[PDB]
Amino acid sequence: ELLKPRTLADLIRILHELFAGDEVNVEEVQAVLEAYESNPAEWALYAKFDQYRYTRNLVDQGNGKFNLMILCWGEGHGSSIHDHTDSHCFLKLLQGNLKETLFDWPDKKSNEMIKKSERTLRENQCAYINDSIGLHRVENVSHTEPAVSLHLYSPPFDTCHAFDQRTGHKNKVTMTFHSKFGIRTP
Ligand SMILES: [Fe+3]
16 A cells, blocks of 8 residues: 655654565656655755765665665766666656667677767656666756755675676776765765
């Protein structure tokens, strides 16, 4: 029985129920994330921006089943083209808009990675990606509005690959947290 999360804390409690077992009902997780109506006062603690690039702010560790984090995207900040390390990845907009560009996995031959599609993710919409679907880039293309998104990854992962758009070549990158549970973590 999926109920509407009344608050961020209620959402977290519901997520612990949805991840109590060993598998993931993607459609139910996405539905509950979509149904949470972003309330800025509930997540202000985690919305810690950096001037130069987007930040990752850990909210909950899901009793080991998932990482739940808030990403804070300054104007013009964006990600690499990246994978998700054999994990489910849900992305819900809490504030602003983000452009998501999808790419196929590269072949062995060095070639330009050509986007397969793009879409604008708007406030409160929850999207989903996994390595079977493909790779993506996420960007705040706004000149005037910072964006904030809520991301859930299951299982949690500390590393992933960035792909060079000119060649498809990949490099391993380690995820760094700007803060954890509201506390800045150098
Ligand atoms: Fe991603």
